[PDB]
Amino acid sequence: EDWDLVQTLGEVQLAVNRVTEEAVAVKIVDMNIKKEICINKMLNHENVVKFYGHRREIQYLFLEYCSGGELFDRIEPDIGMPEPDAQRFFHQLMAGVVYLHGIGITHRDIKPENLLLDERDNLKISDFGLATVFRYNNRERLLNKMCGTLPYVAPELLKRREFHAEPVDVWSCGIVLTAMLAGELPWDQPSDSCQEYSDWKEKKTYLNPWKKIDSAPLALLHKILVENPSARITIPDIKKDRWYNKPLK
Numbered sequence: 426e427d428w429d430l431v432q433t434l435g436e437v438q439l440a441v442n443r444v445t446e447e448a449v450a451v452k453i454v455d456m457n458i459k460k461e462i463c464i465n466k467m468l469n470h471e472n473v474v475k476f477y478g479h480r481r482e483i484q485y486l487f488l489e490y491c492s493g494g495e496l497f498d499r500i501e502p503d504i505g506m507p508e509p510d511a512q513r514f515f516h517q518l519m520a521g522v523v524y525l526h527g528i529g530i531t532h533r534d535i536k537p538e539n540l541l542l543d544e545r546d547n548l549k550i551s552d553f554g555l556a557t558v559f560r561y562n563n564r565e566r567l568l569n570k571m572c573g574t575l576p577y578v579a580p581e582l583l584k585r586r587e588f589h590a591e592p593v594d595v596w597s598c599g600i601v602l603t604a605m606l607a608g609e610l611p612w613d614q615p616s617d618s619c620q621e622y623s624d625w626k627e628k629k630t631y632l633n634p635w636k637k638i639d640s641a642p643l644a645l646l647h648k649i650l651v652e653n654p655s656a657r658i659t660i661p662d663i664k665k666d667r668w669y670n671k672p673l674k
């Protein structure tokens with residue numbers, strides 16, 4: 426029953442059980458947090474950070490501990506990571522996202538800061554403070570709230586009053602893939618005012634980060650980073666992508 430607050434992780438602390446020595450993460454929030462707990466209660470997947478419980482003393486959330494830390498730290502600046510590790514993390518990111526979308530949940534803030542790694546280096550999607558329901562009773566609800574982080578955010582979120590939830594997450598996963606591959610973020614935001622975004626739209630891939638990316642992965646990125654959320658590739662189709670299914674190492 427008794428957990429020692431060993432150290433601060435993120436506030437968030439690592440907790441080690443007094444008897445077991447088991448490690449768990451405790452998110453400390455002094456009074457969005459009611460919804461974060463609700464959503465956590467629905468989630469069970471090996472690519473999502475497991476929820477253990479909560480106690481209302483200041484609110485305390487008990488979350489799986491990931492020794493590996495954030496994926497952000499596995500990306501070398503201006504370099505990225507070896508293509509096979511990227512693909513592996515991407516396969517796990519996809520499995521995690523498929524799951525969430527299956528139980529009608531959208532994370533809404535997918536970035537390497539929120540993708541934790543366990544001891545086996547297995548990816549876990551983390552932090553559902555911005556997540557919301559986009560399907561209930563088999564009924565889809567369009568989203569209108571602006572959420573996320575600007576480099577990661579999809580273009581429709583900027584230019585449209587309402588948008589579908591799933592293509593938004595798919596876009597951020599592609600930005601994440603781009604970061605793993607090139608060790609850099611392509612633009613500050615996906616807007617025409619942004620010069621870098623325009624260059625991509627114009628297909629100038631001889632520029633960075635795209636120049637650092639092999640043709641097979643890049644072909645997938647062309648499918649993912651499509652301005653029209655209706656034309657954008659969907660997850661079931663990412664699954665059929667050649668690079669996605671390319672044996673690596």
Ligand SMILES: c1cc(-c2cnc3cnc(-c4cn[nH]c4)cn23)n[nH]1
Binds near residue numbers: 452490491
């Ligand atoms: C930064 C965060 C972490 C880490 C390791 N395990 C966890 C579990 N949950 C979190 C977390 C962070 N925000 N909300 C939950 C961070 N973790 N490591 N480095």
